[PDB]
């Protein structure tokens, strides 16, 4: 738990790439979670004015 300040800062707001396999899925149910992860709404640090949100790779 003890980190220097700059690295704590960096670790918290890191962008994390997600992979999501598509074959045989309803495109809506796909876009539901794709959108959630895109927007940053899975992160408890989330806020609207923070740049936070993660990459999403749909295959």
């Amino acid at each position: 738990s003890s980190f220097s300040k700059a690295p704590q800062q960096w670790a918290t707001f890191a962008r994390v790439w997600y992979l999501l396999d598509g074959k045989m899925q309803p495109p809506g149910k796909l876009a539901a979670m794709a959108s959630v992860k895109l927007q940053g709404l899975h992160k408890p640090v989330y806020h609207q004015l923070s740049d936070c949100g993660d990459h999403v790779v749909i295959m």
Partner: protein, 140 residues
């Protein structure tokens, strides 16, 4: 006895105090200033009311995300935390969710436990067993 208003300068200054950071001609001309300042105060007081629902929305979202991480949805988490007789703010809860992830996973484990206890109690169709987390304490 003719009287004029000598101090008009400070009268204007008092409404221009608030008008300095506006864009365009509102930060100079006294008319435009007066109107834009009244607007500004009205939205001030409405904002006072809004910002409580905004902050609470924010909190609920953060609780939802923290709850999702452990594979439990928001309503489940909250209800079961309550049925365990743990009264915590959504403010305090969201703060635990960020700055004490361990404690929070403890909470989510508790709620999940209590809920499974609930399903088992209600499906079991008998009145006797009290799940260890299902007992209800009356204060002394």
């Amino acid at each position: 006895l003719r009287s004029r208003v000598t101090d008009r300068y400070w009268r204007v200054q008092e409404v221009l105090k608030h008008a300095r950071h506006f864009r365009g001609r509102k930060n100079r001309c006294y008319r435009l200033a007066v109107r834009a300042v009244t607007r500004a105060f009205v939205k001030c007081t409405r904002a006072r009311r809004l910002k409580k629902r905004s902050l609470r929305t924010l909190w609920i979202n953060r609780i939802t995300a923290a709850s999702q991480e452990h594979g439990l949805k928001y309503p489940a988490f909250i209800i079961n935390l309550i049925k365990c007789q743990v009264e915590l703010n959504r403010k305090v809860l969201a703060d635990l969710a960020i700055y004490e992830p361990k404690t929070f996973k403890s909470l989510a484990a508790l709620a999940k436990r209590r809920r499974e206890e609930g399903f088992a109690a209600a499906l079991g169709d008998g009145k006797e067993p009290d799940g260890i987390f299902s007992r209800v304490v009356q204060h002394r």
